[PDB]
Amino acid sequence: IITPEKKELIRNLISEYNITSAKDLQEALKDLLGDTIQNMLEAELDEHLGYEKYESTEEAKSNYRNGYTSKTLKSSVGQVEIDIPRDRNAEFEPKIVPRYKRDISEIENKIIAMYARGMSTREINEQIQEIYGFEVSAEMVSKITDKILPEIEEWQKRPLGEVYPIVFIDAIHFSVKNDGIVGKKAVYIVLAIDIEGQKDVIGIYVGENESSKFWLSVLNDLKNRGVKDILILCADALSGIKDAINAAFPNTEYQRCIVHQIRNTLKYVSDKDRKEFARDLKRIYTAPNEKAGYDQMLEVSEKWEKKYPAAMKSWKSNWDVICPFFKYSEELRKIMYTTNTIESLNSSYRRINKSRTVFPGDQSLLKSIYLATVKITSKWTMRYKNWGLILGQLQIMFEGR
Amino acid sequence: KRIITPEKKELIRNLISEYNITSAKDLQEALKDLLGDTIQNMLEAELDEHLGDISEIENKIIAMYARGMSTREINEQIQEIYGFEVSAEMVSKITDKILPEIEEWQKRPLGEVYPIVFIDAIHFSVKNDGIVGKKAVYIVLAIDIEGQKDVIGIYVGENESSKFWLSVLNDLKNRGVKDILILCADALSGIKDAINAAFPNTEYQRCIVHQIRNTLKYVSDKDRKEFARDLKRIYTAPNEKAGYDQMLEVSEKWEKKYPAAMKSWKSNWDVICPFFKYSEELRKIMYTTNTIESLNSSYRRINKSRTVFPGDQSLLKSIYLATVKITSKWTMRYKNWGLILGQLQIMFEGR
DNA sequence: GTTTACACAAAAATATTTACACTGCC
DNA sequence: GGCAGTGTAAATATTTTTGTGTAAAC
């Protein structure tokens, strides 16, 4: 839609600002933005004082005009300089450009959207300086990204649904500086499916733990946010977690997430060229009943006890926790042994934090974690397939709930 | 003072009225919408003005090319800032503007003598006339008589013949060089023959640091720290025979759980022998790698765009842009060069 | 008369360096 | 081995706005 008023404006701009080339056009862009802002500030001053420049009024006024003061603005097309009007008693606050504000490009969110991508503060600084003209340092990037800390708290207090059929807990470890020592801390992401079949990160908790009381606090946080019943909760082997699970969620059948079993048994110690033969490990969870699964587990153990460090022993010891997986239907089995639904998150967090070698504090780590989390969950619109068929049977398994 | 004409004031008023500007974002989006196609068509006409100085928008696009961004990334950024689309043809026509600058940079007059010179290779895939081939770009970095390091040359390498190295050396000598004091390049096919053919008067020995890099080509994560920790003993040795003893020791001690890399050490030991003839400071300036691995790794930090290059000139442009962006702030020279000067003048008096 | 502009400090707000306490990488 | 990075808190450095006295415009 090309309005003839716009064409008249274009011809008038080309004429009055002496545009003879494209470079003339960019310099005219700068000059025109500056002049427009100066005109609108002159209008706002006329509004505040109540009269135009040198206009006589019969009623004497306690405020006279007091010249101008300079300020360099930083806009999208480049750096401009303007002269701001000035009242005598210094009473009026500008409306277009507030006091002391020199960033105009509304670049705030963009900088954040870069930090959420995984961009270094120095990378962001170099990019902004190169492709915008004005300079924004790294500490200012940190100060800009500090602004979503209230948003982070509002997400930490987000009201949750009443019942979540399936919940997974995953840990991702990073190097963070606590009390002046850089140690490995694990962040726990709580991903849950609701009654309709939608995957959504329900919670994020920084570890900073050396106890089981932390797990009870996490479960009480989830229970306070609005949750009443969990049907299936799957977490990794962690300190005092089963007791906390049965303290606030007793009816929840806690089973050990099989993808965590395949990772902790295989990936931690495994020849890279023999690594792929997890296909024989598929035989354990494609079994019809728990007894056939245990028999296939023993067979796979005997065939792979030739080079296993300590995996099949963990299978044997934790078979008590892996047992309830078989009572669920075939589609719930599918929802369980799909490693992509957890591994996707883990790989995305790692690929976004690839450049962040060491974090200076807990809140800095939380910032990136929440940003990557929203950047990932924004794209999740496909709900789990074959649902309703899965729902119809799981609601039979758990009748009242 | 911005003395604004009354017609300009009425024009600003008309702009505010047409776009209903009340905030700064209103003004910026107004200018973006109003003048998008204007800027686009002006630039297209000025680029097509070459048979069918540079501006800020074109400098910004040059920087976008410098950071190795996709054509779609540049398109998105320009559409957001100025408000018009930029085609890949437009990007190519804009970036061809620095080609005369590159011509000037490849014909620069060089100094008479350069104490230390390094040549490094970086390999890429480029498509010429529809054939995708592996081309290695060789960067020639040299330190001058005062102690300042600066990239002397950039050369595309075809099949890595000795004729190519001889041609590179003849280019360097025509640009003004007469004698090199120390030349250290990567172990390459038939480079020493060209070196002693075009600069015979001083026996240059190569691979002061490219050899530790070549042993680290198969750098295995588990065996990195201890292997470079014990390999520091090989090049910090006081004497040549002590160096050979440490070489055999490290070879026998780390041939376990690792292929037979050390053979390259033995066969090329004839070339590594004279390295110890240099003193502690002259060795330090060499084996630190602080400037060569820095250059190639900084190039790689911008190498996010792993695309095949559409021509030699595109690769050459990107390499020149990265090189000049590094050398602009890195032209600062290093200390303690007086002892190194006294040592180079003791070893090679005439220079 | 009346207003407005212009300086040049002092004051107030903002943005940029070390500074760290380490990590990964040939 | 060294060395180039990281995010940001503390410590500065920079820029903007403000008191008012005075020169100039209306």
Author numbering:
A (entry chain A): 6 to 406
B (entry chain B): 4 to 55, 108 to 406
What does the paper say about this structure?
Copy‐out/paste‐in transposition is a major bacterial DNA mobility pathway. The pre‐reaction complex (PRC) is a complex of TnpA with DNA representing the first 26 bp of the R‐TIR with six flanking bp (fR‐TIR26); the pre‐cleaved complex (PCC) is a complex with the first 26 bp of the R‐TIR (R‐TIR26); and strand transfer complex 1 (STC1) is a complex with oligonucleotide R26(j6)L15‐5′rec in which a 6‐bp bridging spacer links two TIRs and is an approximation of the Figure‐eight intermediate. In all three complexes, a single DNA molecule is bound by a dimer of TnpA and they are all remarkably asymmetric. In each structure, the R‐TIR is recognized through an extensive protein–DNA interface in which almost all of the interactions are contributed by one protomer (“A”) with the exception of the transposon tip which is directed toward the catalytic domain (“CD”; residues 165–261 + 325–407) of the second protomer (“B”), suggesting that catalysis occurs in trans.
In the PCC, the 3′‐OH of the transferred strand (TS) points toward the active site, a position consistent with donor TIR binding rather than recipient TIR binding. The most startling difference between the protomers is that the NDB is completely disordered in one protomer (protomer B) and not detectable in the electron density. As SDS–PAGE analysis of dissolved PCC crystals indicated the presence of only full‐length TnpA, the lack of density for NDBB was not due to proteolytic degradation but rather to the spatial constraint resulting from an unusual asymmetric packing of the N‐terminal domains at the dimer interface. Although the resolution of the structures is limited and none of them contains metal ions in the active sites, in the PCC and PRC, the side chains of D175 and D241 are in the appropriate conformation for metal binding and catalysis whereas the side chain of E348 is pointing away from the presumed metal‐binding site. When we superimposed the A protomers of the PCC and PRC structures (which can be done with an overall r.m.s.d. of ~ 1.1 Å over 400 Cα positions), the clear difference is a ~ 6 Å change in the position of IDB as it closes down on the transposon end in the absence of the flanking sequence. The comparison of the active site of PCC to the active site of Hermes when bound to DNA (Hickman et al, 2018) reveals that although the 3′‐OH of the TIR end is in proximity to the catalytic residues, the scissile phosphate that would be present on the TIR end is still displaced from the equivalent position of the scissile phosphate in the Hermes complex by ~ 5 Å (assuming ideal geometry). This is likely due to a combination of factors including the lack of bound metal ion to organize the active site, stabilization of the terminal nucleotide by base pairing to the complementary strand, and the lack of flanking DNA that would be part of the authentic pre‐cleaved state.
